[model samples]
Structures are given as structure tokens and as C-alpha cells.
Target: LKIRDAYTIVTCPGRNFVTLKIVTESGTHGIGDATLNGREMAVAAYLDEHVVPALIGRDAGRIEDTWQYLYRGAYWRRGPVTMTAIAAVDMALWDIKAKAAGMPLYQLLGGKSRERVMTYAHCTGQTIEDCLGEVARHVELGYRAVRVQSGVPGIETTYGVAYEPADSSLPAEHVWSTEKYLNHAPKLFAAVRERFGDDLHVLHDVHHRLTPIEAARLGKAVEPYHLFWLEDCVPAENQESLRLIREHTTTPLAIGEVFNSIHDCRELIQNQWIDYIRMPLTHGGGITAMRRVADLASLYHVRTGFHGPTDLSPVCLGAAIHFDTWVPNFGIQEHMPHTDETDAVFPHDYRFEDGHFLAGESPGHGVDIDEELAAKYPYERASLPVNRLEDGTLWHW
Candidate 1:
């Protein structure tokens, strides 16, 4: 089937989201999440000005060729904007193919490796007691694993803590203190274990704010608490940095949410430097590219821990559930529940049970965008907050 038309939908239903819709001559249509968090419009423009025109008469069934045609064919590749644009096209094509085959997307991928896909919920607070209360609240709601974040005693604003969304066009700025965070982190985990005990899987995100040595200390310090993972413990631009962290602690490490290609993580995976890969389908070039990353990760015992922030629309999460269902070396899925307005803008068939997501039997990835409802919430300029060390140096947020 030849692609007949394609377009992007930019909406801000509480938060910004960019989605791409592709239609084929056979009357089949598919949509993909193209959102790049604060940089949503860049991806929307990339799809509209560059990718959509190329997609206009291509064979809808040739998923791989199209992926390469857009990726390798572009000459410039592998940045967040480029990969995210490619990911949207890849997701829509897979959805179209699955619909044509009259089977669910997971079935087309290889069927379920497990009945339900496990997910972890985000629990954050302004204080340790507040964070513990949030953990308890999510546990009562049936979350088996929780990612905990609490404000450090000396730091006024911590990543993933009780922070409000920015209302201005520019990003909000916050201050950080490595010394305070490193000292406070182990105690946070200790508090969690003391309150909830060992049966619960506890996770924490350092948010790429430490050096290799600093991350090692945090990992070592928290070992007694037995964390599910110490996520993004250090910035991984230098894949070799993980080797030092690995040498220092037995705590499992998960990184790579900012990764855009398999090449970005090949060294880390092959060297067994991390326990999990945090690349989500939307940023990792969709199903086709992610399949290759997962297969390679399986060889080294690195499991899939796809990033599932609310910034990634329901479209990405729906497709990720299908991928998470089929991938054999699955680890865990992050779950930052989206706003109700966001969910209503893009309806889906997937359902969450006690602690996992059940794959829907629908013919495609099981999510559909409501263009009419989406149109009501036009695009707005907003950004994830930027961070700075207390001394005034910029830091990761």
C-alpha cells in the first residue's frame, strides 16, 4: 500500500505532545508520538518539512527500507531530533502493517514472552517523610516497584522532587548540591527499606548528576538497601565511565534515557557496564532499531528498561507495552502517569492491572489520537527545568 498522506498533530493537553499520523492508499492509518519533551516543535517541523514529503508515495509495507531511507538516507543522523523523527515514522508504519495483518502489534513482533509487563511508578516528595508517604500511597494502589526521589536537606530544588511545571516560555532554573545529595541518598534508601521492607523493589534516579567516582560511592552506600536499580547514576556520554562505577558496587545500574541510537549504547551493553537500557521506543528509533538494541543487550544480560515519562505521549507507551511484551530480556518500565486530559486526547486499549500492563488484543499498537480533542488544546511553549550547582555552574536536570 502506498502512503497517501501524512501530518503532525501538536497539542498541549496539560503538557506539549507532538504526534505524526500516516495514511495509506488502502484506507489504513497509523499514528506515532514524536514528542521531544521541551523541544517538541523541532520534531514537528522535522516531520512536516522533511520526512512527510518523502513518505508520500513510499510503499507502506516496507518498514525496514523506509527506516533506512529516512535514517541513512538523510546523510545526517542519530541526534535526538533526527532519531525522534525517524521513530515516529517507524511506529506509524508498524501500526499500519499490524492492522493490515489483522493481528496485535506484539503478535507481529513474536507474541508474549510473559503475560503482563511489569512497571515502576514515580514517587517524589519535598521531604523524606513525604516521599515515604507517597511510596506508601502508590503501594496501596498496587505498584510493585517505585522510583523514589526526595529533596536533599541543603538543596532547595532537587530533580524529580516536588517541582511545579514551568508556566513561562523559558525553562525554570533550580540549584543543586552534590555533597548534600550523595549524603542524603543512602539515607533515603535506608528509610525506604526500613519502612517498606525488602520485598518491595525500590529504584532511584541520580539523573546524571554525578561523576563516576561519586556514582560508585552512592551505589556502594545504597547496596545494603538492595535497590532494583540506581538509574542514570552518572552522565554516560563517556561509556567508559560506567566501568569505574561497575568496579565499585554490586548495585544494578540503568542509564541511557537520552540515547538516540544503538551505537550510543553498544559499548556499554557489550562491556556489561549497565544492567538496563533506558531508551524508550520514541527516542530510540522505534521498534525496528530498538529490536536490534534489545537483541544485543540480551547477549550481555542487559535488560530493557524503557523510559516512560509523561513527556512521552500515550502513543509511545502503548507501542512500548507491545515491545516490552515481545522482548525476551525485559527488565522494567518506568511509569509516570499522564494527566487525565492527556489520556483523553489519545484514547487507548491497553489496561493496567495490579502491577503490570496487559497487552490489548487490538489489531495495531492499540492507541489512537483524537484529532478533534487534540485540536482544542493548541501548542504552548514550555520546557523541563534547567539545573545549576549551588556555586553557580550548570548541571544536568
Candidate 2:
């Protein structure tokens, strides 16, 4: 079908989200998420200033060609801005295609690979005791897999633990001490397992805070706890860093959350350096491009473990769960619940039940937005966070 119109919409229901809506000549419409946290507007600008103009007259059915064109046609390629822009377009087209086929998006992606997509929920607190309570709360709520993060004794604030409840300020300030955390975390996890038992799956995110050697030590220390994965243990910018971590411990590794291209993860996957690949559908250029990456991962032993956080709109989460349902080489999915305001802005059909997501059999990706409600929360400027080491050098947040 001929492409009729396309537009980028920005909203900040709880956190900023950039969505791209594309309509076909027959009046059918589809949505995609273009949000790049801390730089949401950059992707919006990329779509409006560059991609949208080019999208207006192109055939909407030519999903692959359009993705390749947007990706390769521009000589300068493969950053968060450029790839996320392409992702929005790619996702919108898949939504349109599934709607045209009158089936759910997962149906087109080779149907369900499993009955439901298993999801891991984040459980964090300012103290280890606080994290225990949080973990109990989630367990009672029917979460089978839990990601545990707690404040170190000396650090004021960390990635998962906020200073106070629901702190929404831009760049909610945090401090870090690698030495303190390296010592504290293993004990914290041991206490969790002692209380919660082995039946429950536990996951952890080091959030790229450690050096290769430090990450290796952390991995080795937590070996007794049986973590589902140790995520981004160090900056994967140097993909070979994983080699050292893999050498020291048998702990499963997951990487690639911030990656924009397959090349960013090719070595990691090819060498079987990581257990899971954490690329989100929004940042990884939607179904077409990400499936290609997933295929690459399948060739190796790596599986898909997409990054799903509150920052991602329900629209993106819906598309992701469908991918989770269909990808043969599936690992696990992150399940961070969105705020009520975000749920209202983008009403969705998928729901978490007993630690898994059932991507509903809706005509599209099982998500739709309320443009009027979305407009209520206008874009607000906010940064994710910048971590300062004890000595004041900036580190990855």
C-alpha cells in the first residue's frame, strides 16, 4: 500500500516517549516507538527533519527496502539517533502489515515459539533489607524471576535504588564506589537466596560499572547464588572485555543494551562471549533489523534478552513481547511496569501474569495510544543520570 502520511509525537506521561505514527493510503494506521532516553527529542527531530519527508510517498509494504534505504542510503549511519529513527519507521510498517493480514504481529513473525514470554521484574531498594521487602512484594505479586539491586553501604544512590520514593527529577543524583559495591553485592545476593530459596530465578545488572577484572571478580563472587544473568558487567564498548569475565566465572553474561548496530554485538555473539543480547526493538531498528541480529545470535548460542524499562512506551513493550513470543532463540525479557499515567496514555492489551507476558492476539502489535491523553503530559526535559566515582570521575550510569 502507498504511504499517505507519517508524524512523530512526543509525550511525557511519566517519562519522555517519542512515537511515530504512519498511515497508509487506505487510511489504516500503525504506531512505533522512537524514544531514545535522555535524547528523545533528537530522534523526534531526526524523523521530522530527515526521515518523515522521505517516508511520505514511499510504499509502506516495502518494509525491508525502506529500512535498508534509511539505514544505508544515508552515508552517515548507525548511531542511536539514526537507527532509532529507522526503528520507528520499521516498527510502524510491521504494525501496518500485521493489521493488513488481520493477525497479531507475532503471527507474522513465525507464530509463537513458546506459550508465553517469560519476564523478569526489577526489585530494588536503598538497603539490602529494603530490597528483601521489595523482592517479597514482587514474589507475592506472582513474579517468578526477579532482578535484585540494593544500595551499597557507602554509596548514596545507585542505578536501581532511588534516594526517595518515585524521585522524578532530571538526572536524579547518585554516587558510586566500586570498591564498596564490589565487596557488598555478593553478600547482599547471598542473603536474598538464603531468604527466597532456589526455586525463584534471580538476575542482576552491574550496569557497566566495573573494569574487566573487577567484573570478573564480581562474577566469580556471585557464583554460589545462581543468577540468571550478570548484565553489562563492564562497558561492552570493548567487546573483548567479556573474555576476561567469561574466563573467571561460569556466570551467564548479557550485554548490548545501548548498542545500535549488529556490529556492536557481532564479536560478542560470534565468540559466544555473552549468554543473552539485550538490544531493545526501539533502539535496534525494529522487527526487520533486530530479527536479523537475532538470526546472527541464533547461529551462535546467544539468545534474545531485550532491554525493557519504564522509559520505553507501552507501544514498544507490546512489540517486544510479540518478538519474545516468536523468536526461536529466546532468552528472557525485562518487565519494568510503567506508571499509571503512561498506561493511560498508551492503552495496551498485553499483561504480566505469573512472571510471563502473553502478547495478545490483536490485529496489530496489541497497543494503541490516546493522542488526547498523551498530549496532557507534554515533553519535559530530564536526563537519566550521570554517575560520579568516589574520586569524581564520570562513570557509566
Candidate 3:
């Protein structure tokens, strides 16, 4: 069917989420999130100015062709803005296709691959003792697995310890620093296993602040703890960096959270550099393009470990659960607790038993956003995730 008009909807979403909704002439549509932490609106502007103009009055069924053209046709490639712009268009098209076919997007992705997608939740504490308490909380709440983070007494800013764990009004921030944190993390995890007995499927994200050698040391030291996966141990600028860590330890590794192109991970997947690929964020052209990442990973035995942040919006989460249910090659998923406000903003039909979210059988991603509630949270300009070195140089987070 011929395309007619398209529009992008940008929402502030409390903790800064900018989403794009694209509609087409065939009465088919999809929702996508281009939210890169605080830099949400910029991607929205990129779509409104550049991508949307190109999308109007085109054929809706030419989804793959348009995706190829958007990705390759652009002279400059692989920046967050351009990738997010392409992602919004890609997500909307999938929405349209699934809706038109009268099926959920998972069905479009070749049906169920597992009974349900296993998810890992974030549990943190002020001290190692406190961290264990939070871990107990997760286990009590039915989380079979959890990503445990804790505060190092000497570290200025630790990765996961929350200033206020149960505060519902607002979340206390965890600013990123890599001084004592780098040295103390391995010991902290070692203590966790000593106390918790290591039967839990523990996962973690180092947040990319280490050198290749440093990462290898961290890997070697934590081998006794039995990690499900160590997420993003370092900046993946060097594809070969993974080999050092792989050789040093048996701790499973996962990478690709920041990547936006196939080439971004060509080596990592092809060489089997990592245990799982983290390419499921809607930032990389939603499911349309991330599917390409999954396929490439499949050839390398790299499974899908999608990124699911609080800022990912329920819209994104709903779609991700569906992918988790359908994708053939699955690793594990990240599950930072969502604010109840967010859960209310976009109500879903998914179940959360044993920390795993079962994508609903309902049409589409199996959720609906309350436009009225979303409008209440106006867009606020905030910068995306940042990290500081021991010497205070800015780096990837």
C-alpha cells in the first residue's frame, strides 16, 4: 500500500525518554524509542527534520528496502543521532506489519523460541552486607536471578549501591567513577559468593571503564563467583580486546550495548569474541535492525542479551519481551527496576514471575501508552550517561 503521512511523538517520560511513533497510509504503524539517556530529544529532532521528510508518501510495504537505504544511503554512518533516527522508522514499520498481519511482532519474528525470556534484575546495597540484603529482597520477591552491585567503602562513587533503595518519590543517583571501584569490585563479588553460596545466576555490568589487561584481571579474579555474564567490561573499540579476557577466565562475557551497525560487531560475533551480544536496544533501529544483529550473532553462537534500562520506556520493554520470547539465540536480559509511574504510563499484559517477563499474546507489543499521562511529564533536557576516570578524563559509560 502507498504511504501517506507520518509523524514523530516526543515525550519527556520523567527520567528523559524521547520516543517516536510513525504512521503510514496503509493504516499500519509501530512505536520505537531513540532515547539515549539524556540525549533523547536530539534524535527526535533528527527524525523530524531528516528521516521523516524522506519517509512521507513512500510505499509502506518496502520496509526492508527503506531500512537499507536509511542505513547505507546516508553518507555519514554509525553516530547515535543517525542510528536512533533510523531506529524509530524501523520500529514503526514492524508495528505496522504485525498489526496488519493481525499478529504480535514475535509471531512476525518466526514464533516462540522459548517458554519465556529469563530476566536479571538489579539489586544493590550501601555495604557488602547491605548488598546481600537487597539480594535477599530480590530472591524473596521471586527473582531467580539478579545483577548484584554494592558500594566499596573506599570508592568515591560505586556502580550499584543505591542511596535510597525503597524511595518511591525519586531515585537516588549513582554517579560513575572508576578509581577504587576498579580495584575493589572483584573482592566485592568474591565476598558475595562466599556469603550467598553461588547458586544464583549473578550478572553484572562494569560500565566500560577498564583497559584490556584490567578487564582480564577482573575476569580472572572473579572466576570463583560463577557469573552469568560480565556485561560491557570495557569499551569495545578494539575487537581484539575480548581475547585477553576470554583467555584469562571462564566468566562468560557479553558486549555490543553501544553499537549501532553490523560492522560495529562484525569481528566480535564472527570471531566468537564474546558469549552473548547486547544489541537489542531500540536505539539500533529497533527490532528491524537488531534482528540483523541477532542473525549475525547466531552464526557465531553469540546469543541476544538486550539492554533494558528504566529510560527504555515501557513501549520499548513490551517490544523487547516479545523479541525475548521469539529470538532463537538468547543469552540473558538486563532488568533495572522501572518506576511504578512508568509501569502506569504504559500498561501491559505481561507476567513477571521468577523475574522473567512473559510477552503477552495480545496484538502488537501487548501494551498501550497513556498519551494523557505521558503529556504530564514534559520533556527535560538532560545529558546521557557519562563516566569519569581516576584522572577525571571523560569516557564511555
Candidate 4:
């Protein structure tokens, strides 16, 4: 079927989301998320000015061709904006194709490998005690695994901990210190294990904060805690840095939330430097691209751990659950539940129960946007925090 009309939707249910809605000749419509965290409007504009023009009247069934045209067709490609724009188109096409086939998206990919997609709950607090209490709450909610982050003693704020009292309308900044955190984190995990025991699988995210050696030191220190994985311990731009961290410790690394293509982590996956490839479906060029990444990671004994934060709309999370349901080498999926306001705008059929997600059996990705509700919450400017060391030197955030 030919794609008839399309438009990009920018909404702020909680945070900004850029969604591409494609209408086909057959009267079927598909939704794709183009939310680029800090740079949402760029992709929205990219779709409106450049991408959507090429999409109208094109064959909606040509998923691979469309992806390649958007990728190789752009002389300067492979950045977040390019890949995310391509991802929006590719995902929308898949949604259309799945609806046309009268099957769920997972079935189109090769059917289910397991009953439910196992997901990890995010639990964080300002202190170790508070974090432990949050962990207990997740456990009580029936989550088998939990990702833990806590406030460091000397540091003003941390990567994963939410702001105190929380200003959901606006983002906040925080000061960071590697020295305080390196000493503080291991002790926090040690106490967590002592208090909560081994029944729950505990994980941590350094959030690209440490150096290779510092990551090595922290990884080595937390080895006794038996973490599920230490996520984004250092900035993964230099893939060679992982070699040093891998040599120094066996903490099971998980990296690449910001990645947009498989080539970005070809060295990491092919070399088996990490145990989990944590690329999000929305950021990593959609299912068409991620399937290839998953294939490469599978060959290296690595698995998929999609980056599922609140910033990602329900469309991304719903698609990820279906993907996890079918991927042979599926790893854990990160899950931060959306706020009531956010969920109302983008109604999804997926649900979390007993530490796993059950993908809805509806045709396509089992997600749709409420245009009226979405319009009520217009786009807002929100950005992730920037980090500065004690000496005021800029650091990764």
C-alpha cells in the first residue's frame, strides 16, 4: 500500500516526544517514536522538512529499502538525528506491515521464544537506606530484578537518583565527584545485598561517569555483590576503553544507550567486551536495525537490554516488549514506568506483572496516541543534566 499522508507529533505528556504518524492507502495508520531526549525538535523538523516529503506516496511495505534510502541516501548520516529520523520511518512501516498481515509485530519477526518478556524495575533514592527501602517496594511489587542508584555522600546529586521533591515540569542540574562515588557505591551495594539478600537480582548504572581505570576499580569492587551488570561505567565512545575495563574486572558490562547504529558498537559486540548491549529500540534505528545488532551481539554471546526510560514514549516501550518476546538472545529490558499524565496521552496495551512484561496481542505494536490528550500537553523544553567535577571541569552526563 502506498503511504498517503503523514505528520510528526511533538507532545509533552511529561517530557517531550516526537512521534511520526503515517497513514496508508489501505486506511491503516502506524506510529513511530522519534524522541531524541535533549534534541526532540531537530528530528521533528528533520521528518517534516526532509524525511516526510520522501515518504508520501511511497510503498509503505518497503521497510528495508526505506531504511537504506534514509541512511545511505543521506551523504552525512549515522548521527542521532539521522538515525532517529530513519528509525521513525522504519518503525512506522513495520507497524503498517504488521497490521496488514493481521498479526502481532513479534509474530512477523519469528514468533515468541518465551511466554513473557522479562523486565527489570528501576528503583532509586537519595541515600543507601532510602534506596534499600525502594528496592523492597519493587520486590513487594513482584519484580525479580531491580536497578539501584543512590546519592553519594559528598556529591550533591547523582546520575540515576531523582531530584529531591522533584520538579517534573523542569529538569534540574547536579554536581558530581568520582572520588566520592568510587568509595561510596561499593559500600552501598554491599549493604543492599546484606539487607535484601541474593533473592533479588541487583544492578547498577555508573551512567558514563567514571574513567576506564575508575570503572575497572568500581567493577572489581562490586564483583562480590554479583551484580546483573554494571551499566555505562565509562563513556563508550572509545571502544578500546572497554578492553582495559574488561581486563581489570569481570563485572559484566552493559553499554550503549545513546547508540544509533550497530557500527557504533561493532567493536564492543564483535570483541565480546560487554555482556549486555543496552541500546534502546527508539535510539538504535528501530526494529529493522536492532534485529541486525541483536544478531551480531548473539554471535558474540551478548544480549539485548533496551534503554527504557520515561523519556521514551509508550510506543517505544511497547515495541521493545514485542521485540524482547521474539529475540533469541534477549537480555533484560530496562523499565521506568511512565507517569499517569504520560500514559494517558499514549495508551498502550502492555503491562508489567511479576518481573516480566506481557506484550499485547493486538495487531501492530499495540499502541496508539490520543491526539486530543496529546494536544492538551504541548511540547516543553526539557534537557538531561550536565555534570561538573569538584574542580569545575566538565564531565559526561
Give me the runs in candidate 2 sitting further than 4 Å from their true place.
163-173
Which residue segments of model 4 deviate by more than 4 Å?
Answer: 163-172
lDDT for each residue of candidate 2 in 116-186, tens digit (9 for 90 to 100) = 88888888888899999989999998888999999888678877876222345566556789999999999
**Which model is ahead, 2 or 3, in terms of lDDT?**
2
Model 1 C-alpha lDDT per residue in residues 202-277, reported as the tens digit of each score: 9999998999999999999999999999999888888998999999999999999999999999999999999999
The window of 10 residues in a row where model 4 has the poorest summed lDDT is: 163-172
Task: Score each candidate by Cα lDDT.
Answer: 0.92, 0.89, 0.75, 0.88
Q: List the residue pairs that clash in candidate 2.
A: none
Give me the displacement of residue 303 in model 2, in angstroms.
1.4
Q: Give the TM-score of candidate 1.
A: 0.98
Q: What is the TM-score of each candidate against the true structure?
A: 0.98, 0.97, 0.91, 0.97
Best by lDDT: 1
RMSD to true structure for each model, in Å: 1.0, 1.6, 3.2, 1.6
Global lDDT of model 2: 0.89
